[PDB]
Amino acid sequence: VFHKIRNEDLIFNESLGQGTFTKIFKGVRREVGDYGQLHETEVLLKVLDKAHRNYSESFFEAASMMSKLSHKHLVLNYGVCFCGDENILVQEFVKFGSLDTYLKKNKNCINILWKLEVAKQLAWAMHFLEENTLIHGNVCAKNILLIREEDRKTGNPPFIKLSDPGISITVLPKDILQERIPWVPPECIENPKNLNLATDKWSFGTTLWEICSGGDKPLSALDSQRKLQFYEDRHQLPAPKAAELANLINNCMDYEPDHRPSFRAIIRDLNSLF
Numbered sequence: 001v002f003h004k005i006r007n008e009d010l011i012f013n014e015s016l017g018q019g020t021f022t023k024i025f026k027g028v029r030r031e032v033g034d035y036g037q038l039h040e041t042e043v044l045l046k047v048l049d050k051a052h053r054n055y056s057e058s059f060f061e062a063a064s065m066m067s068k069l070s071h072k073h074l075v076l077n078y079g080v081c082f083c084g085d086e087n088i089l090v091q092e093f094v095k096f097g098s099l100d101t102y103l104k105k106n107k108n109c110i111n112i113l114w115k116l117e118v119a120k121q122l123a124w125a126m127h128f129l130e131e132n133t134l135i136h137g138n139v140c141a142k143n144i145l146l147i148r149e150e151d152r153k154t155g156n157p158p159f160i161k162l163s164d165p166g167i168s169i170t171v172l173p174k175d176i177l178q179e180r181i182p183w184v185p186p187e188c189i190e191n192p193k194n195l196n197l198a199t200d201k202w203s204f205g206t207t208l209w210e211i212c213s214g215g216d217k218p219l220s221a222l223d224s225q226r227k228l229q230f231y232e233d234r235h236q237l238p239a240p241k242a243a244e245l246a247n248l249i250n251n252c253m254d255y256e257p258d259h260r261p262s263f264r265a266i267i268r269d270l271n272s273l274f
């Protein structure tokens, strides 16, 4: 169970945008830290309306279950504020933010070896989740959080974490799932009860496309109905700008869920692109 954080100890300072039935802020948590030291810690706050009770329960159960698994590539959630009519996730503030925005701000002036390192780190996160049989369900480049930029002098790569899962596609409205094509795989559009570990392999492919397309969104020109039809017609994504990951994307975006390769196999493939 998440640590409870008092509303009194949270300051809200900036409105940052919106997720799926969430409102996002930057703020400050006043906390007693290690050694009893008082810290004012920058935090990312995700606010759910308690009136959307089913969405809130799904969101916080998903965040809590994944935060039980401490991992270098999984975002740190500090706890939850049951803040009256709203429930608030208090998450670490990642310095460089979402990867899709980062790639746009840097005009896709990143090389293929940087892309490979990010892809490997995500695959290692996904392998850990697979070993724990924990479905994420919302893998995408906006949910790749850049902790550190590369440092050419030390040779250190960029370093990422995967964000929390959000509301489950098993409870979201069908129209939201359709807007999330081609991250949500064809079997889950057909029936959201088809959610499975295989879901994340498909979404990982779509996320590799994003990484290799400088933060562009695939199928952005298609409305919900044309995206539903895109799956009816069994189409695949176009090859990305950086074509080096084209094969891996196609192998992951397999319309047969049982044919999508394991994360361990994906890691081996990424390693061999060298």
Ligand SMILES: Cc1ccsc1CN(C)Cc1nc(N)nc(Nc2ccccc2)n1
Pocket: 016, 017, 018, 019, 024, 044, 075, 091, 092, 093, 094, 095, 096, 097, 098, 142, 143, 145, 163
């Ligand atoms: C921020 C946001 C907007 C819509 S969704 C969402 C949350 N998340 C997907 C992105 C995120 N998560 C975490 N934990 N930290 C950050 N840092 C950050 C934020 C803004 C600028 C620079 C850095 N960004």
